[PDB]
Amino acid sequence: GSSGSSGTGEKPYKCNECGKAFRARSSLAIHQATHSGEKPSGPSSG
Ligand SMILES: [Zn+2]
């Protein structure tokens, strides 16, 4: 694995969906726009 630690690193925003941490809101939002998912046309996967 990895330590994923480079000097400073404050996690002001935390995604209550997976566990991601962004520096600002905009950064968090853009991501939250990936979780959305329903009525999938093609369950072939899973
Ligand atoms: Zn997330």
Residue boundaries of the structural domains of the chain: 1-46
Q: How far is the CA of 5 from the centre of ligand 1 (A)?
A: 20
Q: How far is the CA of 14 from the centre of ligand 1 (A)?
A: 8
Q: How far is the CA of 31 from the centre of ligand 1 (A)?
A: 6
Cα 38 to Cα 7, 27, 31, 45: the distances in Å are: 39, 23, 17, 14
Q: Are 27 and 13 in contact (CB under 8 A)?
A: yes
| Site of tokens 């690193």 | 9
- Structure method: NMR
The whole-angstrom separation of Cα 44 and Cα 40 is 10
Q: What is the rounded radius of gyration, in angstroms, for the C-alpha atoms of the chain?
A: 15
Can you name the residues that pair with 22 across neighbouring β-strands?
Answer: 13
Q: How far is the CA of 23 from the centre of ligand 1 (A)?
A: 14
Tokens of residue 29, six digits: 């939002």
Which residues hold their Cβ within 5 A of ligand 1, which is an ion? 15, 17-18, 20
Q: Which residues contact 22 (CB under 8 A, 6 or more apart)?
A: 11, 12, 13, 15, 28, 31
Instruction: Indicate the SS3 state at residue 2.
Output: coil
